[PDB]
Each structure stands twice: as C-alpha cells, then as structure tokens.
C-alpha cells in the first residue's frame with residue numbers, strides 16, 4: 010500500500026521532470042526500465058527506517074539480505090563474520106543497464122563493486138578482455154593503489170551490484186588489516202594476466 | 211493523535227520493508243517488540259522540536275527527563291551541574307534486547323553507555339565475569355585510552371541506555387578536565403579486577 | 412493560512428512531546444509563551460524559502476528585515492554596507508525569556524549576540540554590574556580572544572536577539588579586517604570598567 | 613499536476629513569508645517575476661530525483677540538458693567529453709535580474725559562471741567596460757589566482773547562468789590538468805585588455 014504508492018508517486022515526479030526537460034522517448038523508456046529494475050514497484054526511506062533501529066538489528070538485517078552474496082563469494086564466505094558485517098553495513102545497492110560504463114580506464118576511482126547478479130566485461134586499450142559475474146568483485150585495484158583505473162568495466166546484462174566507497178573500504182581494512190592482503194593477492198593475479206605489474210602490491 | 215498516528219504509520223513502513231526483504235516471522239516479531247519498547251506508541255521528530263527551542267529550554271528539558279539517571283549515578287549526582295547538563299545534552303537514547311552484544315571485545319570503541327534501566331554482563335575470554343545495572347556506565351575505558359575494547363558487554367534484559375560518542379565525550383572533558391580523573395579512577399579499579407593494567411591510566 | 416496552520420500543527424507536536432515526557436504545567440506554559448514570542452503564530456521553512464532565491468534577493472531581504480537593527484547600532488550604521496550585508500546574512504534570530512542565562516562566565520564562547528529588543532544584565536563574581544539594551548551587542552570578547560567568557564549575561568525582559576557564530580564572525584572579519592579593531596576598542600573599553608585587562612587587545 | 617501544484621504551493625509560502633516581514637509591493641513583484649523566470653511554473657526535488665538514478669543516467673541527462681551550452685562554447689565544444697561531463701554534473705542553475713550585481717570587484721570569489729542566456733557588463737573602477745553574452749563565462753580569474761575579484765559583473769538582462777564552485781572547479785581541474793591552461797590563456801588575454809597583469813598566470 011504505502012510503499013507501492015510511494016513508488017507510483019515518485020515515478021510520476023520523474024516523468025514530470027523528464028517531460029519538463031523534454032527528454033526523448035527512447036531515454037524515457039530506459040529510465041522507466043531502470044526504475045522497475047531498481048525499485049521493483051516499492052519505495053522506502055531506508056535511511057530513516059534503519060536509523061529507527063539499533064546496531065544489532067541493522068546488522069542482523071544486512072546479514073540476512075546478503076546471505077547469497079556472502080555465501081557465493083569466497084572472500085566473504087571464509088572471512089571473519091565481523092569483518093563481513095562491517096563491510097555489509099557500508100554497501101550501497103546499485104543497478105546498471107546493458108552497455109553502461111560502470112568504470113572508465115584512466116579515471117580516478119572512488120569505489121569498488123560486488124556483483125550480486127549480472128555479467129560485466131573488463132576492457133583495456135590493449136584488447137586483453139575478461140568477464141566477471143555473480144560472486145566476483147571489481148574496481149578494487151585503484152582503491153589499493155590510489156592510482157588510476159587499470160581498465161574499463163562495462164555492463165553486459167542488467168547488473169545488480171553493491172558498491173563500497175574508498176573511505177569505507179579504508180575504514181574497514183584499518184580494523185581488519187589481514188583482509189587487505191587477500192584483495193592484493195587477487196589484484197596482483199589480475200594485473201599479471203594483462204601485462205601490468207605494480208611495485209605497490 | 212498526531213504522535214500516535216506517526217508511530218502507527220512509521221511502523222507500517224517497517225512492516226512493508228520487512229515484507230519486501232522477506233525477513234522471517236521470528237525476526238519480524240523481535241522488530242515489533244523492539245519498536246514497542248523503544249517508541250512506546252508515539253513518534254516525534256525530536257531534532258526538529260528541540261531545534262525550535264533555545265539553549266535554556268533544551269537544557270531545562272534534558273535535566274527534567276534525566277532526573278533519575280542523574281540522581282542515581284554518583285558521578286553525575288555530585289558533579290558540577292554544568293558538566294552534567296553539557297553531558298546530558300549530548301546523550302542519545304538507545305534500547306537493546308536480551309542477548310544483544312552491545313560491545314564486542316577487541317573492536318574499536320566509538321561510544322560509551324549509561325544504563326538508565328537494565329542489566330548487562332561484562333564478558334572477557336578469560337572468564338572473569340561481572341554485572342552492571344541501573345546507575346552504572348560502561349564502554350568508557352576505550353574512550354579514555356583510544357585502545358580496543360577490553361571486554362564484551364551483553365544485554366541480559368531489555369536495556370534502556372543513553373549513549374555518548376567519543377567526540378562528545380572528548381568535547382565535554384575539554385571544558386571540565388577535572389571529571390576525566392573520576393572516570394580513570396573507576397577504569398583503573400575495573401581493569402585491576404580482571405588482571406589488566408594500563409600505564410595510560 | 413498555510414503558515415498559520417504550520418504553526419498550529421508544530422505547536423500540537425510540541426504539546427504531545429511535553430505530554431509524553433510529563434513536563435510540569437509551569438514549564439509547559441513557559442514553552443507556550445516562548446513559542447508565541449518566537450514564532451508569533453506563523454511558521455516557515457525559511458532555509459528552503461531563501462534557498463529558492465539568489466544572492467541579491469536574499470541580501471535585499473536581510474537588509475530590509477534588519478533596517479532598525481542596522482540604523483540603531485553605530486557599528487553597523489557607519490560601516491561599509493557590504494560588511495553589514497555579510498554579517499546580516501549570517502545572523503540567526505533567537506528569543507530569550509526573563510531570568511534566562513544567555514551566557515555563563517567561565518565557559519567557552521561559541522557566539523555573540525546583537526540585541527534587537529530587550530534588556531540584559533552583565534554579571535561578574537566581583538559584583539561589577541551593567542545593563543545593555545536595544546542597539547548594543549555582547550559576547551564578543553571571547554570571540555576576539557578565544558578565551559573564556561568574562562561575565563555572565565542574563566535576560567531581564569523578553570529578548571529578541573540575533574546571534575553570530577564564532578566561525579561566521581571570523582569569516583566576516585577576514586574579508587573586512589578593519590572592523591575587528593572597532594570591536595576591540597569597545598572590548599578594551601568594557602574590560603577596563605570591570606578591572607580586567609587583556610594583552611591580547 | 614504534482615510539479616505544477618508544488619510550484620503553486622511553494623510560491624504561496626513565499627508570499628506568506630513576504631507578507632509576514634511586510635516587504636514592500638515593488639520588492640514582492642520582483643520576487644514573483646524571479647520565481648516565474650527561475651521555475652517556470654513547475655517545482656521538483658531534483659536532488660532526490662537524480663539521487664534515485666545512477667551515474668550513467670545522471671550523466672546522460674546533464675549532457676542532454678546542456679547541449680546548447682556545450683555546443684556554443686568553444687572551451688566545452690572542443691574538449692574531451694569526459695571533462696565536459698565532469699563539469700556539467702557540478703553546475704548549478706541560477707537566474708539573475710537586470711541591475712543585479714552578480715560579482716563585486718575587490719571581494720573574494722567562491723564561484724564562476726557560464727552564461728546560457730543573457731548579457732552582462734564587466735565593470736572596473738578605471739571605466740574599462742565590456743559585455744559578455746551567450747556562450748561565454750566569467751568569474752574564473754579569481755578561481756585561478758585565489759586573489760580578489762578583478763572586476764564587477766552586472767546583469768543587463770534576465771540572465772540564465774550555470775555556476776561552478778571553487779572546490780568543484782578545482783576537483784575537475786585535478787583530473788584534467790590540460791584544461792586549466794585553456795582558462796589561463798583567456799584570463800591573461802582578458803587582464804591585458806584592462807591594464808592588469810598577473811605573474812601568477
């Protein structure tokens with residue numbers, strides 16, 4: 010009722026904004042589809058809801074909502090549950106559409122991404138080309154090295170992702186320094202399958 | 211009327227969120243009970259209300275609301291009323307449920323807690339085990355030493371607590387340096403009843 | 412209509428909050444009176460309103476609203492209008508009730524106050540006692556010296572004041588360093604009529 | 613419907629605010645006209661709308677909305693599209709009325725402005741006087757030199773501008789250092805047509 014009504018009302022406002030700015034019909038349809046994939050017909054003031062709770066309830070909720078994400082991703086599945094919880098509570102859900110450039114090579118990276126569902130293409134100017142899918146993650150190398158993105162990453166399907174900002178990534182790896190090395194070893198692994206090599210790792 | 215309606219409406223939204231994410235029935239009931247204990251059937255935009263007032267009225271209100279807390283806790287009861295008021299105005303009310311881990315040993319501490327009503331268990335790996343209840347406080351040692359939590363603390367009953375963040379704790383002990391020593395002397399006292407000893411105090 | 416309704420609705424919420432916390436009848440009446448003096452039966456989301464405007468309109472409005480304040484206070488009346496405008500745009504309107512301690516001696520000062528209407532008493536432990544009224548200001552010495560308040564200041568009547576925070580006071584005196592000396596000369600003047608003397612001025 | 617209603621309701625609130633503060637009839641009319649020019653009968657919570665989207669959609673929208681601005685301004689039109697997008701996503705739309713002083717000489721500059729539509733006068737005490745119009749920009753020199761504004765700039769017509777804050781201007785020129793030199797070369801050009809000369813450029 011009230012969450013469904015909230016969705017309908019919020020979408021009406023998006024339509025009037027698009028109408029105001031006279032966006033073309035193909036772009037409006039892409040926004041409509043994004044909305045349906047992202048919100049699935051219900052909208053919540055989530056910050057407000059979880060802010061009404063306490064630490065333990067929020068932590069229980071985020072663990073329940075991400076059981077699949079956690080269990081299918083070896084880095085999370087075998088790690089200390091408190092590190093997991095600390096990551097989970099900082100993740101932000103994002104949806105991307107086919108063809109979207111999630112990350113552009115050469116730019117400065119502010120976040121990494123965990124793939125809950127979807128396939129992405131990792132792209133470099135040197136044509137060395139890979140897929141990542143459910144249970145994997147990407148965008149981490151730049152966070153480790155504070156460098157520039159080492160590849161472009163493009164959505165091949167609709168992608169349901171969870172992102173983590175650089176500040177949060179760093180806040181969490183302070184408390185649990187052991188897990189930084191796990192990311193590095195995979196990062197090194199990945200760079201060496203595309204000709205790169207950082208002294209920094 | 212309007213605060214009761216606000217509670218009912220806000221809770222409906224929590225139900226639709228829980229329904230959306232398909233939380234199980236036991237967890238929904240725990241959220242329901244938390245809500246009833248925490249808000250007691252009325253909801254307020256408190257920040258907005260007190261922001262409409264001035265310093266003196268806010269200070270009078272917070273002193274009236276915490277008379278019991280202040281009078282039953284020797285550190286507050288015998289202290290300079292301006293220090294009390296300065297602490298009181300920074301406290302945030304929190305409710306925890308039986309079994310909840312309020313604090314985990316080894317983690318980094320961002321806040322301490324004053325028990326208005328309830329019983330908690332202080333737990334260490336070395337089995338040295340104590341209760342704290344109404345009129346006591348905990349979580350202060352880490353704030354004093356910027357170290358890691360020296361114990362776990364678990365709720366035994368429903369707990370009505372007031373928390374104070376590390377930044378506020380520090381802001382207040384700047385203006386009133388005399389009261390830091392009162393916390394330290396009890397902190398030292400507490401560590402020596404569990405085999406620990408900090409040079410820092 | 413809508414501002415009057417906003418006032419009535421907001422006050423109803425204050426009543427239910429006071430009722431919830433069981434504040435006594437004398438304190439509720441004091442809150443009622445404060446509300447009537449402060450909002451005068453209409454409420455506005457002012458931040459939102461002025462945020463909908465531009466710099467020039469906001470600056471024209473604040474100059475029109477404070478004509479009396481500006482004209483009756485020699486420091487503002489004879490100063491560069493751009494300095495005035497820059498101060499005015501940072502002022503926050505506050506109402507205090509008789510007996511209220513606006514400032515306590517010994518504490519750390521975060522703001523100064525311009526009296527639009529009312530009388531206040533400047534109080535020191537050494538009994539040296541003065542009145543300030545319409546067109547005057549107070550609380551400035553601490554901002555100049557970053558020291559501790561040199562006196563207490565208490566409301567004798569209902570007081571309509573405009574406050575300026577330490578950060579804003581400093582932001583403005585950067586751009587217009589000439590006006591700091593005007594405050595200092597009056598500050599020095601004031602300290603020497605109560606036995607104090609700062610090398611800092 | 614809902615955006616038009618939002619406009620009507622928001623304007624009613626502006627009227628009651630103006631009525632409360634007893635602004636004169638000429639100033640009320642100027643506010644009415646500003647409102648009509650600025651919002652054109654519809655209001656949106658834009659931050660909320662675009663926050664509901666993702667990076668790629670926001671970037672597509674801002675590029676579509678500013679096609680004219682981009683195409684008519686050589687600095688944007690011939691630049692790397694990613695630099696353009698990065699600027700565009702930080703621009704804030706502003707409307708000014710004839711006679712408004714957008715910038716005052718001598719003051720400290722916090723933003724620059726891109727003229728989508730309108731004419732402005734660049735004014736200096738030394739009477740050296742120029743017009744800028746659609747496709748041009750101004751207020752950049754101070755951002756480059758962190759100095760004081762080198763001229764006043766006044767609106768001659770209704771002006772539709774996009775502003776960029778100093779922090780954003782700097783954030784963008786970090787990622788794309790090549791474009792700072794393009795601004796400098798025009799800045800130098802401009803200063804030398806009014807007798808000034810900065811070693812800093």
Ligand SMILES: O=P1(O)OC[C@H]2O[C@@H](n3cnc4cncnc43)[C@H](O)[C@@H]2O1
Nearest residue numbers: 131139147148149150151158159160199
């Ligand atoms: O540099 P980033 O922050 O942003 C681009 C990302 O692409 C991923 N990547 C790079 N070479 C790869 C080889 N194989 C799989 N994945 C790869 C990796 O997560 C990079 O992190």
Ligand SMILES: O=P1(O)OC[C@H]2O[C@@H](n3cnc4cncnc43)[C@H](O)[C@@H]2O1
Nearest residue numbers: 332340348349350351352359360361400
């Ligand atoms: O280390 P913290 O920040 O977080 C865990 C808290 O447990 C409390 N504590 C430790 N030994 C204790 C012995 N007796 C009573 N209370 C005790 C004390 O407040 C600790 O502060």
Ligand SMILES: O=P1(O)OC[C@H]2O[C@@H](n3cnc4cncnc43)[C@H](O)[C@@H]2O1
Nearest residue numbers: 533541549550551552553560561562601
């Ligand atoms: O120290 P503050 O920040 O806070 C207390 C204020 O009291 C005012 N004051 C002090 N001696 C005074 C003598 N005469 C008039 N006014 C006086 C002055 O504005 C002080 O600034």
Ligand SMILES: O=P1(O)OC[C@H]2O[C@@H](n3cnc4cncnc43)[C@H](O)[C@@H]2O1
Nearest residue numbers: 734742750751752753754761762763802
């Ligand atoms: O100093 P600002 O930050 O603020 C005042 C602005 O006036 C513009 N300006 C100065 N001399 C000019 C000559 N011709 C055209 N435009 C001019 C230029 O953008 C200046 O940047």
